[PDB]
Ligand binder design. Sequence first.
Ligand SMILES: [Ca+2]
Ligand SMILES: [Ca+2]
Ligand SMILES: [Ca+2]
Ligand SMILES: [Ca+2]
Ligand SMILES: [Ca+2]
Ligand SMILES: [Ca+2]
Ligand SMILES: [Ca+2]
Ligand SMILES: [Ca+2]
Ligand SMILES: [Mg+2]
Ligand SMILES: [Mg+2]
Ligand code: NA
Ligand code: NA
Ligand code: NA
Ligand code: NA
Ligand code: NA
Lengths: 510, 510, 255
Amino acid sequence: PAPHGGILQDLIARDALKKNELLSEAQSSDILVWNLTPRQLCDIELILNGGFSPLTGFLNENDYSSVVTDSRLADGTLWTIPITLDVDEAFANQIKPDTRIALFQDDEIPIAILTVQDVYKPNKTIEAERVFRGDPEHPAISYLFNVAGDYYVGGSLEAIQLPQHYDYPGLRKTPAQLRLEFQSRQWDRVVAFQTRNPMHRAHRELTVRAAREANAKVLIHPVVGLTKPGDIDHHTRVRVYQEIIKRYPNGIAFLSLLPLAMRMSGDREAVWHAIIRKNYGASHFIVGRDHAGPGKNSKGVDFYGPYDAQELVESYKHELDIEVVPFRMVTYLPDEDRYAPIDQIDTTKTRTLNISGTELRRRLRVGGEIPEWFSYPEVVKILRESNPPRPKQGFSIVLGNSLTVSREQLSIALLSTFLQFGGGRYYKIFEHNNKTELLSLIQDFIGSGSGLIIPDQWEDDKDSVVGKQNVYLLDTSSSADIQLESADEPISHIVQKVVLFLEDNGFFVF
Amino acid sequence: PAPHGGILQDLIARDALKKNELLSEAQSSDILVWNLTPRQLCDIELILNGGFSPLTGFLNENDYSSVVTDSRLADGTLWTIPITLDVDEAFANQIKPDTRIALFQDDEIPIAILTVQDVYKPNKTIEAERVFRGDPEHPAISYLFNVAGDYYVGGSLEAIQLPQHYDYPGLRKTPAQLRLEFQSRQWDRVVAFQTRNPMHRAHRELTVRAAREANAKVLIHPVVGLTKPGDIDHHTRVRVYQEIIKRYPNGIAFLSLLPLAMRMSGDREAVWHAIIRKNYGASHFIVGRDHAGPGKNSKGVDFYGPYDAQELVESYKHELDIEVVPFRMVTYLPDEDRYAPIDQIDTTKTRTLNISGTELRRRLRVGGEIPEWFSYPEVVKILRESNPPRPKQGFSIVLGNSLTVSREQLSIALLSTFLQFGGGRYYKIFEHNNKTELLSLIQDFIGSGSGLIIPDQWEDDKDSVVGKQNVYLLDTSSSADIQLESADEPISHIVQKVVLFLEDNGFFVF
Amino acid sequence: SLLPLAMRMSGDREAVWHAIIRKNYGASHFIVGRDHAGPGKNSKGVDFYGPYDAQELVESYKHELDIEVVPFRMVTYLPDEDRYAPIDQIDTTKTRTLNISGTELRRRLRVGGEIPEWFSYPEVVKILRESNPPRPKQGFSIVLGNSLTVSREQLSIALLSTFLQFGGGRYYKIFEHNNKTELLSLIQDFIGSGSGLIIPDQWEDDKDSVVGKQNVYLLDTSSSADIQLESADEPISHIVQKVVLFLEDNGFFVF
Ligand SMILES: [Ca+2]
Ligand SMILES: [Ca+2]
Ligand SMILES: [Ca+2]
Ligand SMILES: [Ca+2]
Ligand SMILES: [Ca+2]
Ligand SMILES: [Ca+2]
Ligand SMILES: [Ca+2]
Ligand SMILES: [Ca+2]
Ligand SMILES: [Mg+2]
Ligand SMILES: [Mg+2]
Ligand code: NA
Ligand code: NA
Ligand code: NA
Ligand code: NA
Ligand code: NA
């Protein structure tokens, strides 16, 4: 269909003949420079390549206010997520309307020149409530208060280049490029599938069925910009998508990566997704159950209703100009060796099988079997490599402050003891001396599968520097992961406590 | 047989009732303390447990001179390797005869009190020549000049405790303990096998044949103290011995670890080994081809003749009091599915198979098959775990000084590129800022299988801090491992050069 | 030994006839099954014969048959005891049993599913799979219905080129029968050989009897079509996709 607003705002194309000129200006000594943050880089790529058509810059207060309260740009164009350039006061103060500033990536690569229209301090309390529903635990609200700048700079953009990416050069198609890929294949009906997770057998099945019903080709369009905290890394996911696209009938599907920064904003995000896929050339779009939903908060309540997304999108159906295809999740029928829509089974007493996210996680943690009816083996293999089981995981044992036994001797005893076991894990007594440059390497060694023996705790104000995954405290305190009977417990007894704790937790298998 | 000199000089036993007293003295504030070096700890353990009977301390100049020139202690007792306490001038100066000094381990554990008899500066030139044959490349000569102290302190020892070891508590039998293990089994004929390497099928076969011919039981007595530079680590080797001892007929063999610091001194060392095994309770000993030989020097010449060891030991046969069993290395006969003594085959046209050390190393490097006729599969599995193949090895790419392209961008491009590949290797851009505490971690990450991207070289006087294994220099210089066509070669071309170099060297497999 | 008999599927009377024939062939004893020689149930689901009619008729003639009839004791598998036991001797005491019906066996052979050794010897199963290959190895025909107004030559060519992309080893052919019996009768021969035929036009109705219906699918707008077209002039690329996805859904193509 036609881009949202009618014209694809591909600014790279629009400004092609101004590239040298804009680059020189961006590099002039007198121009103010703002280094884009990771989320701003995702957003600016989508504005610059027309993925956010009709947007041609970051929203000034006029459009922003209208999006916050009315889900529309000031001119009435449907638009549910505010895209703004958030900066701190020190920068906002040296800015005024008409000022032209250079926007860089990594303080080295000029990306665009922004012509300032306005500078404002938005009420982040109202934004959180009106756009993200108010729950302080909502990923977007957490970001909005703890990470985002307090000042928004509205303005028009002129393109120099899209944010630099060295991985997957072939798969990161812009809207113009994707439309040409579809055109060269004579594809005029394409149904897009959104995802920020690995794809299992059920997803392959549901997308092929969607294609069959809409008489459309398939576009697997995963998000590789920012997704939900804790999600599988995009490199692992892309490997999974590259593997699964090979399981579709030849010529039915195309894989392209979307550098979007999701807000995990449920229904409003679903509408935003529909618009973006339309800009990218899709004729149809699948809106999932709890689409773009961040789950439940700490008290167990849903941030969004499971069908809020499908209902909001349905309310705007007459002006979206992209067909939404009903979501028919499928499940496996052992006795029939096939998959069927969950809305069509049971009631007649029919056996079904499924593996939840929690169960999948468990199996990967213990190195357990994962059935081919659930996920293609080549996909499972990829997931195991990126998320190895306990016998292959790294860890750290921290000698707590309470210890009065020799820390040097206890560290040496632990190292010598661990070196007896087979397995191939690399071990090291690691002294950080409370230095950030050393503390930040702890998770790097753990991520490499190594076992670190840390002779002393770091100061509390350094905690934030060390991730807590697989880090265990050996101490007398009740908070200790491995509790000592006493501060001067004999070294040989301490060693045994540690070895048995590690075995009980799967790090050692005998 | 009886210990060398007639009495087992087990000083731990002799001084049992003086332990508290010696410990208190060792901890007194006025006593001089010497912290034992790694080799001195191996030597003192053997003196203290009677393994070096008749020695009861470190050799004074009188005994030392006699050992150097006559291969005997001043009283005429056969003894071929000088065992002395080497210290630096600053320490030797505050010493005089009769002074009692405490000898510690790790500056914390009191090991013994030494009553000084003399302090002297030996002629390391004559020692190197008379004892180790003079080749500056001999492991012992290298140690003697670059590591050993220039002053020797002769003196009698009183024991507090043997050097502390937290690994393999069960297998480190002292001479008294080993003799009791043999006695409890009624073993009065025992043939000892020396080794500092993994044991393959040929070694199991040769030791069982030795047992059959000498009507003796088998003692596998591997060295776990100091061995030849570059040898497989003792933890890996001990795992191999524990696995292979299970392939002997039940009740025929016993495994015990020897904390000896070898000098790699060929024939003289072979004689020293015979004496030590006699002290440990063995009735027979196997002297190998090029026994305890460090190989060939840089010019390809042998440090020792292949039969020098067997001949020197034979010359002392009438006073050693331990029977030397002829070395009959075996080889595999495919067509007969059995092993036979190499001195009994061929001439009659007989097919044989063998795998050299170089070939074994190659196979482990590429992940190639290693036949069960050569080595038990459970042993091979252990060796692969400790020495993983290239696709599982870590590495570092160092951006050379010549580079004028952005180091930040090139590092980021390499990381993103590497993250595309499967495999499970962990990657990190590692900034050392020429700090020793960071530089020393490079081989730790490589040892954990990780891939480091290092944006700049360290200063030359820091080279010694970073091992060179799997560290590759990307630069324009002809010395570069990955040579750049020019200092400003485009980043995408540089990335491809690096990826293809890594693939060609086996780190990436597609 | 093989018996060249033409059964009538005549249940009880046939069972008696069978007893006489086996006696002629030299047997001293004969087993009369449950619903022996029974053709099953009719269209309304009623049995042509009672399950024990055969055993009862034969029993009524026992004194003049001169061949001993041995009681039929069908057995079933007891997983927990790794053995087989007479079904008339199990259960009641809560005993787990396993069995595979004819319908289930047929299903498994159609999808290429596992068939347990406790049910049938693997060498027997292998033979059955060879003679009754699973869907990815079965032949088929797609018939371009009379309703189509798109080019039949182009649509046939598009289907052939499309099918040739897929792996598998199936042989494909655009097959013109021109309503000739000598060609029509070969359709099931190609299907039986595992081949995929693309037939550009339907044959006349009075020729239907010449072509078996197994694995023959009609692409047409009519509600009777196996693969229903949205319209008579649906674009060729959309028609091709409908056909490929129908074939995949029915197991002929596996990706
Ligand atoms: Ca703030
Ligand atoms: Ca819910
Ligand atoms: Ca205490
Ligand atoms: Ca010196
Ligand atoms: Ca030689
Ligand atoms: Ca140049
Ligand atoms: Ca019935
Ligand atoms: Ca029409
Ligand atoms: Mg980009
Ligand atoms: Mg010790
Ligand atoms: Na920088
Ligand atoms: Na709701
Ligand atoms: Na210390
Ligand atoms: Na010689
Ligand atoms: Na009846």
